[PDB]
């Protein structure tokens, strides 16, 4: 979860999210450099009584300010696409969980072995227990084993939704008639929150996602108890 | 032919600045007000 | 000296750093002493 | 075949008329006969209430709301089946 | 007095009547679809026809009767018509895109195949082939009409143009009959959707193009066109060829490859 | 006389004026909508008590700003006023069709307002994605009214595009090549080509949405074998070109403004600028699926759209650096117009750079549908487009009206606006990075501070807008008539005086072929 | 840009009036709606 | 396909279209369709600029392929010079119509 | 049929100051008035329909 006055990304929970953090640092450096350069040049152009208003030859200068940006773009693109193909590469999951979007809640299905499914609704603000998070807690969390590669399948039974968990670097649209696949792996136990990320009507703001990441044995027992 | 020159190439009169103020306030003010009254309308239906 | 709207197509006076010698003189109609001054200008400026 | 003819020099209107009556309209006459023979109202297929067909998400804005615009009773079943 | 060759147009009410007819047609479609009334829509359709009639009448008055169409003005209209046809090509490409998207990746609800389960496509070698010959033939005849006009031949221009129009009418009646005879409908999933919306918009364009040709027929009867100045006719011919080419793409894509 | 002049117009200047008036009125509607957005968000909890209303407001905001403020002002307003004057043409090619392009807009706007008034409105987002925009999730007339609103606006712009391309190609002096036309004329030309090619695809898509809603088609409905993602492809195939359409005339105006107030006879690297705009136009058609990185597209496709999107930085950079090189060596006049243009250069650049961050599909997974995107586009669009419009307005108002603004008041207005927009939008980057979704009526408690500051910013911009209305009043109230304008030798639009006569260039310019 | 002096000069006082009236035309209607938001919700 | 009955432009063209057609066959250009060829541009051999009135806007493309066009009002009287390149232009009024 | 274009050319180039849309005569004025009546009357009717569609019903 986000904490108050936060400026950057949520701390990374997956090694892919850690890759993204370093890639963002790389890209942001370039962004701050270019924007501050532009602002400085502006100030430079505007702070001299010296003049030169005759026709200026442009050919030499356009080489520099085409080739340099091209190189910079390649320097962004290389690690970008490395991460892209890293995300996509072969995984071998231990478990498959499905999530279905609804107006306005998520359902989850764990059907590798038994038929375990349930709905997950936002806790209304009036029903929050002390210390619980407004708009974020659900009644039934998505319990999952930590330190394990999980295949998430995402779809919807009505309109578009999108299933997101920022700290795991995850966002996958939930589209009826389609079954979208993403892979999930938490380095740590804990509670990891997200929110519906496609406008789905009136209560778009009010159908969160809460993952509960625990040791396999606790997951196994929880599963059996949810039948 | 049509009127030409400053204050004449426009579909509103600038002949009197107070009448103009009135017209400009109705014009711009009606645009700005409209969404507030549509919100109101939608709140009152249901 | 009076610039009129009807004069828009004529060369005009401007004070600019980068256009130091404008197309027209600032004063077009000289007084009698100013005309004598322009006559005196044709002799030594010392 | 690009074609198989060849013709240039003093063409214009005369050449295009030649093509109209010598090639174009004969083709249309031939396709008109081919169609006059290979028509004849054919076997209407057995009705199966497939859910991807006979879609009704909103009533149509004409008739009883359940008939398509060029509805042919012989060959177009309703969601509930053929009319008889 | 101007010393350029361009046309300063008299102030006109037709832009405003056209725009309001757009409001009446759209709000009319809404009223028809939702508050089952046709009244606004019929007013809209009436005013739209009145607008088009008077607008294009005035263009004839400006050109044929008043002489405002200098070569410069005519060159502008040529660009205008080409650009308008380009925009229409792109409109159709949206429907082709939809057709290929649906047909190349048929979903499980269709049975995972194209044509879908339960759809019996028309035979492309029967009436669709006739339709193809008809529009191709009409491209030949319009070219004859054009060459006759440029050669100063009134009678053969009229004959060729009449033939062109007749073929257009024939295509239209053939397609109306095919629509009636088709055992699938617009409500038959994505097959019906893509088929009837794409061919239906094409059909509309055929009617529009036929109407344009009919206008040129009556203008030719009344001696409007010269052997060198007849842009209305050229525009109608470009439009007609456009209609033909769109047919060919539909025929190859929907009727042949998509069966 | 009045009716003949203002309702039956066939005059490019008067139609231009109508467009400017329309756009200004639309701008107030859009602003009001923007403020309701920020009011809802300005403290935690609910203000309106109805998130369908919130979503309707968000949707209307975007449609008003894009289709009724920016496009009418830039293309309809500045385009109609300036293009024929800049090429010495007596009017547009199709002066009567020009008038229909204008008059289609009030009905288009009425349809949109109708949509918000009937049922519970169109709470869809400006993308209008099915199935949310379908006949089950948005039953009734609202979405149909929205669709028809877009159809009218589409027709208007396509006809306008036809008119502009024709005018610019056909109506220049016989000696003037395309490489002797001003950059603003190029910017309108290229914009027009984009509209001509993009809007018909939008028209196809929304018509398919219309038939899904009312004729039982299933283009976008899985039950009939359709696909919601098809709609997104069709929408964005238009939608990306649309954003270049929105900025290109701005780039054209900025080139003129920077050139003028630098006391230069010409922009630096004219052919590079032309090249840049054409390149941006072309590339703008091959990048659209960067709006769809989270829908489930293959990795190779993502790689392609990432790479192609980034390429756009190259020509855009040539423009940015060329504006700087135009300033370089200038006798800088610190007019209010120049301030707007300098603000444009910096703020556009910041916005463009966050675009490049977003182009990277891997990062975009986390940033998509967050306030980072909202920050991105209010920098490039809100600020970029608006700053160009303001700069253009201040610069050319004396041409259009014959009266001068109070420059001190205009500088005050800029200062307030600069503070406002930056306080509004800069914090939204933090909101985005920390994961706040867009299109939310309320947020988890941790996001309170940035939302609070952002909403306070929105009120500063409101004060700027109110002041702008006063400034225009004061100008018309005081009636200081223009006498002399500098640099007319390289700014032809000014050479017929202020305002120009109803008919200009009745006798055309004389240009030798040398 | 050079211009003539104002044909109908607008004094500081007249500017205060113009500004005040402009500001009120935007603030009062919206103000009324927002103040009464609560009333509307109960209906 | 041959025979008659279609009018020619000679027979049926009217108004401005006709005036343009007739002026063209006499090799004249009163409606400014063609680009004028430059003279040497000296004081002795100025570019002659027809006008139906006492002034006309000149655009000077000082050198071939210049993108910047230099614009100014040319008044009746003594030849005037382009402010950029100095080439001479002289107004020849009447020359166009009444 | 006979070529009567010259008659029309004379009619439409007559120096009577009428705009092209009214220059054919009284019929033009009538068609104009019909078109404009239907447009404005239709537009008023659309506004009424909006008003009616903007509120819930019995
Ligand atoms: C499913 C099938 C699909 C197939 C494909 C579809 C095909 C369908 C095609 C239908 C559309 C055809 C349009 C052709 C128009 C031809 C005009 C032309 O080219 O001549 C140039 C003509 C030149 O004439 P001119 O004498 O040289 O002088 C012109 C001057 O302006 C001065 O003259 P003027 O212009 O002021 O007016 C001259 C006018 C005289 O002026 C007047 O006094 C009155 C003018 C009234 C104008 C009406 C406005 C129409 C718009 C109304 C829209 C609503 C629909 C209602 C229709 C009502 C019809 C009255 O001349 C007339 O007399 C015209 C009447 C001719 C009577 C012929 C009747 C034929 C009936 C055939 C029945 C056969 C049955 C046989 C059975 C036998 C068995 C027993 O100039 C024009 O008229 C302007 C042309 C504008 C062209 C733009 C058209 C845009 C189309 C959109 C509107 C569509 C509806 C219009 C047609 C209505 C049909 C009834
Ligand atoms: C564009 C604005 C123009 C200015 C207009 C002024 C008027 C408007 C007023 C409003 C003006 C407010 C100015 C405050 C600037 C603070 C920026 C910062 O500290 O950012 C730091 C980063 C670091 O990211 C992280 O990983 C966070 C963890 C590490 C640091 C946090 C340590 C903990 C500290 C917590 C307490 C701090 C208190 C809060 C401190 C936060 C302050 C808001 O944050 C991020 O990622 C955010 C990425 C933003 C991306 C924007 C791209 C454009 C580049 C910048 C344009 C200007 C260039 C010219 C150079 C600038 C010259 C103009
Ligand atoms: C004026 C409007 C406008 C303009 C010009 C742009 C310009 C760009 N945008 Fe923008 N964008 C929008 C308006 C605009 N955008 C809107 C409205 C949305 C949201 C749509 C919605 O969902 O509602 C959006 C969303 C959007 C997305 C989708 C994000 C998402 O939803 O997840 C992406 C993805 O790549 C993108 C990228 C870009 C890029 C690469 C540019 C480039 O064209 C920018 C290039 C410019 C620069 C880079 C700055 C100048 C260059 C230099 C100084 C040279 C040196 C620089 C480098 C070497 C990097 N933007
Ligand atoms: C040109 C486009 C444009 C402009 C100017 C704006 C202007 C503003 N917008 Fe934006 N906005 C969008 C386009 C624009 N917007 C789009 C496309 C979306 C996405 C909608 C969706 O998700 O579906 C959006 C969404 C959006 C959101 C996110 C809502 C959500 O995700 O829930 C917010 C939040 O703060 C916001 C706020 C503002 C504010 C405070 C302003 C302004 O108040 C900032 C100050 C600017 C002005 C006040 C403009 C003044 C101009 C004039 C008055 C014209 C003058 C005319 C002449 C001089 C002739 N808007
Ligand atoms: C898979 C689904 C597909 C479904 C549909 C399929 C196919 C649809 C195709 C339909 C076409 C069918 C019939 C049309 C037939 C004839 C029309 C053309 C008539 C003609 O004769 O065209 C000529 C070519 O011009 C011209 O392209 C002038 C062009 C005007 C400018 C256009 C600019 C906009 C286009 C953008 C492209 C980029 C521009 C590149 C510029 C490079 C310049 C060297 C005319 O030359 P001209 O000197 O301009 O004429 C005098 C003034 N106009
Ligand atoms: C003679 C040739 C045949 C075509 C012409 C004749 C009649 C149709 C009239 C207009 C067609 C125009 C556009 C196409 C739109 C929708 C598809 C309609 C094409 C059609 O006619 O398809 C018919 C359905 O008509 C239907 O639903 C409803 C048909 C009527 C209502 C349609 C109204 C909606 C119009 C949408 C307007 C938006 C377009 C805007 C354009 C963009 C502008 C920028 C098919 O009949 P069916 O019984 O399902 O199957 C056959 C079973 N034997
Ligand atoms: C059953 C009835 C149903 C009716 C429905 C259809 C109704 C209407 C559509 C029919 C289109 C008719 C267009 C008639 C145009 C006539 C005016 C004309 O053709 O005007 C010509 C100029 O061209 C010009 O404006 C060129 C102008 C061309 C206009 C192009 C028209 C296309 C309109 C299509 C609309 C598309 C809608 C698509 C929906 C998505 C005049 O110049 P010339 O011909 O050189 O004459 C001069 C010489 O005589 C001098 O010697
Ligand atoms: C459900 C949604 C409903 C929406 C309704 C549509 C909105 C309004 C409909 C009203 C249209 C009726 C009026 C006819 C318009 C004729 C335009 C025309 O014909 O314009 C011509 C220019 O365009 C040319 O050539 C090129 C030809 C352009 C023809 C334009 C015809 C209308 C186009 C509508 C469809 C546009 C695109 C659709 C596909 C994406 C002539 O230009 P003017 O300036 O008049 O004169 C110039 C003079 O020199 C001539 O003497
Ligand atoms: C792009 C433009 C598209 C143009 C669309 C044109 C569509 C034509 C619809 C035809 O509908 C027929 O005509 C009747 C009317 O003539 C309908 O009466 C129906 O509709 C009336 C609406 O006024 C009701 O009053 C009647 O009760 C009701 O039976 C009837 O169902 C149907 O056979
Ligand atoms: C987001 C856009 C910007 C919004 C900011 C608006 C700033 C405020 C402007 C003043 O608006 C007025 O405020 C009064 C209260 O101060 C209201 O009177 C209300 O309250 C008074 C005292 O409580 C009563 O006398 C009145 O009857 C009652 O209408 C009055 O209606 C309202 O017009
Ligand atoms: C050839 C053309 C026009 C030159 C002219 O006729 O004036 C010029 C104008 C802009 C030029 C381009 C732009 O300057 C941007 C690029 C700059 C690089 O230095 C070379 C490639 C580059 C892509 C240029 C190639 C070429 O010199 C262009 C395309
Ligand atoms: C009436 C006219 C006579 C010669 C003339 O006016 O120039 C002739 C010349 C060409 C004739 C038309 C053409 O031959 C084409 C058509 C042929 C059909 O058999 C009769 C209708 C048809 C549409 C003819 C009607 C009429 O007889 C026309 C128009
Ligand atoms: Cu579900 Cu947003
Ligand atoms: Cu984009
Ligand atoms: Mg999304
Ligand atoms: Na809120
Ligand atoms: Zn020169």
Coordinates of C-alpha atoms in Angstrom, one line a residue, chain F residues 207-392:
Chain F
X207 CA -21.5 3.5 -35.5
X208 CA -20.8 -0.1 -34.7
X209 CA -21.3 0.8 -31.0
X210 CA -24.6 2.4 -32.0
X211 CA -25.8 -0.7 -33.9
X212 CA -24.7 -2.9 -31.0
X213 CA -26.9 -0.7 -28.8
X214 CA -30.0 -0.5 -31.1
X215 CA -29.9 -3.0 -34.0
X216 CA -28.8 -6.1 -32.2
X217 CA -25.4 -6.3 -33.9
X218 CA -22.6 -7.8 -31.8
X219 CA -19.3 -6.3 -33.1
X220 CA -18.1 -5.8 -29.5
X221 CA -20.3 -8.5 -27.7
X222 CA -18.6 -11.9 -27.0
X223 CA -22.0 -13.6 -26.9
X224 CA -22.3 -13.0 -30.7
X225 CA -18.6 -13.6 -31.4
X226 CA -17.6 -9.9 -31.0
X227 CA -14.7 -8.4 -29.0
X228 CA -14.6 -5.3 -26.8
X229 CA -10.9 -4.9 -27.7
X230 CA -11.9 -4.3 -31.4
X231 CA -13.6 -1.1 -30.3
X232 CA -10.5 0.0 -28.5
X233 CA -8.4 -0.5 -31.6
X234 CA -10.8 1.5 -33.7
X235 CA -11.1 4.2 -31.1
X236 CA -7.4 4.6 -30.5
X237 CA -6.5 4.4 -34.2
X238 CA -8.3 7.8 -34.2
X239 CA -7.4 8.7 -30.6
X240 CA -3.7 8.9 -30.9
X241 CA -3.8 11.0 -34.1
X242 CA -6.4 13.2 -32.3
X243 CA -3.7 14.2 -29.7
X244 CA -1.4 15.3 -32.5
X245 CA -4.3 17.1 -34.1
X246 CA -4.8 18.9 -30.8
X247 CA -1.2 20.1 -30.5
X248 CA 0.0 20.6 -34.2
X249 CA -1.8 24.0 -34.7
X250 CA -0.3 24.9 -31.3
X251 CA 3.2 24.2 -32.5
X252 CA 2.4 26.4 -35.6
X253 CA 1.3 29.3 -33.4
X254 CA 4.3 28.9 -31.1
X255 CA 6.7 29.1 -34.0
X256 CA 5.1 32.4 -35.1
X257 CA 5.0 33.8 -31.5
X258 CA 8.6 32.9 -30.7
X259 CA 9.8 34.2 -34.1
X260 CA 7.9 37.5 -33.7
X261 CA 8.8 38.3 -30.1
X262 CA 12.4 37.3 -30.7
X263 CA 12.5 40.1 -33.3
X264 CA 13.4 37.6 -36.0
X265 CA 12.3 37.6 -39.6
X266 CA 12.0 33.8 -39.6
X267 CA 12.0 30.7 -37.4
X268 CA 15.3 28.8 -37.1
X269 CA 15.5 25.8 -39.5
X270 CA 12.2 26.2 -41.4
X271 CA 12.6 22.9 -43.4
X272 CA 13.5 21.0 -40.3
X273 CA 10.2 22.3 -38.7
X274 CA 8.2 21.2 -41.7
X275 CA 10.0 17.8 -41.7
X276 CA 9.3 17.5 -37.9
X277 CA 5.5 18.2 -38.3
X278 CA 5.2 15.8 -41.2
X279 CA 7.2 13.1 -39.4
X280 CA 5.0 13.6 -36.2
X281 CA 1.9 13.3 -38.3
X282 CA 3.0 10.1 -40.0
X283 CA 4.3 8.4 -36.8
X284 CA 1.1 9.4 -35.1
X285 CA -0.7 6.7 -37.1
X286 CA 1.4 3.8 -36.2
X287 CA 1.6 4.0 -32.3
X288 CA -2.0 3.7 -31.1
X289 CA -1.8 0.5 -29.2
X290 CA 0.4 2.2 -26.5
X291 CA -3.1 2.9 -25.1
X292 CA -3.8 -0.8 -24.8
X293 CA -0.6 -2.2 -23.1
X294 CA -2.7 -3.9 -20.3
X295 CA -5.4 -5.5 -22.4
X296 CA -3.4 -8.8 -23.0
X297 CA -1.3 -8.1 -26.2
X298 CA 1.6 -10.3 -27.3
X299 CA 5.1 -9.4 -26.1
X300 CA 6.5 -8.6 -29.6
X301 CA 3.6 -6.3 -30.3
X302 CA 4.3 -4.4 -27.0
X303 CA 8.0 -4.2 -28.0
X304 CA 7.0 -2.7 -31.4
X305 CA 4.6 -0.1 -30.0
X306 CA 7.2 0.9 -27.3
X307 CA 9.9 1.5 -29.9
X308 CA 7.8 3.3 -32.5
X309 CA 6.2 5.6 -29.8
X310 CA 9.7 6.7 -28.6
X311 CA 10.8 7.6 -32.2
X312 CA 8.3 10.6 -32.0
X313 CA 10.8 12.3 -29.5
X314 CA 13.3 12.8 -32.4
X315 CA 11.2 15.1 -34.6
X316 CA 9.5 16.7 -31.6
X317 CA 13.0 17.5 -30.2
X318 CA 14.0 19.2 -33.5
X319 CA 11.1 21.5 -33.0
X320 CA 11.9 22.2 -29.3
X321 CA 15.5 22.9 -30.0
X322 CA 14.6 25.0 -33.1
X323 CA 12.4 27.3 -30.9
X324 CA 15.3 27.7 -28.6
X325 CA 17.6 28.5 -31.6
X326 CA 15.0 31.0 -32.7
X327 CA 15.2 32.8 -29.4
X328 CA 19.0 32.7 -29.6
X329 CA 20.4 36.1 -30.5
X330 CA 16.9 37.7 -30.4
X331 CA 16.0 41.2 -29.3
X332 CA 13.5 39.6 -26.9
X333 CA 10.3 41.5 -26.3
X334 CA 8.8 40.2 -23.0
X335 CA 5.2 40.6 -24.1
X336 CA 2.4 38.6 -22.5
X337 CA 2.3 36.4 -25.7
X338 CA 5.9 35.6 -25.4
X339 CA 5.5 34.5 -21.7
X340 CA 2.8 32.1 -22.8
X341 CA 5.1 30.6 -25.5
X342 CA 8.0 30.2 -23.1
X343 CA 5.7 28.5 -20.6
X344 CA 4.5 26.3 -23.5
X345 CA 8.1 25.3 -24.4
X346 CA 9.0 24.2 -20.9
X347 CA 5.6 22.6 -19.8
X348 CA 5.1 20.8 -23.1
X349 CA 8.6 19.4 -22.7
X350 CA 7.9 18.1 -19.2
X351 CA 4.6 16.6 -20.5
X352 CA 6.3 15.0 -23.6
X353 CA 9.0 13.5 -21.4
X354 CA 6.4 11.8 -19.1
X355 CA 5.0 10.5 -22.4
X356 CA 8.3 8.7 -23.1
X357 CA 8.2 7.2 -19.6
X358 CA 4.7 5.9 -20.5
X359 CA 5.9 4.6 -23.9
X360 CA 7.7 1.8 -22.1
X361 CA 5.1 -0.9 -21.8
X362 CA 6.9 -2.5 -18.8
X363 CA 6.5 0.7 -16.7
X364 CA 3.1 1.4 -18.2
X365 CA 1.8 -1.8 -16.7
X366 CA 2.1 0.0 -13.3
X367 CA 1.3 3.6 -14.6
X368 CA -1.6 2.8 -16.9
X369 CA -5.0 4.0 -15.6
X370 CA -3.4 6.0 -12.8
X371 CA -3.0 9.7 -12.2
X372 CA 0.5 9.5 -13.8
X373 CA -1.3 9.4 -17.2
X374 CA -3.6 12.3 -16.0
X375 CA -0.5 14.4 -15.1
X376 CA 1.2 13.5 -18.5
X377 CA -1.7 14.8 -20.6
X378 CA -2.7 17.9 -18.6
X379 CA 0.9 18.9 -19.1
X380 CA 1.0 18.4 -22.9
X381 CA -2.8 19.1 -23.5
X382 CA -4.2 21.3 -20.8
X383 CA -1.0 23.4 -20.5
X384 CA 0.4 22.9 -24.0
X385 CA -2.8 23.5 -26.0
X386 CA -4.1 26.1 -23.6
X387 CA -0.8 28.0 -23.3
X388 CA -0.6 28.1 -27.2
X389 CA -4.2 29.2 -27.4
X390 CA -3.6 32.0 -24.8
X391 CA -0.4 33.1 -26.5
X392 CA -2.2 33.1 -29.9

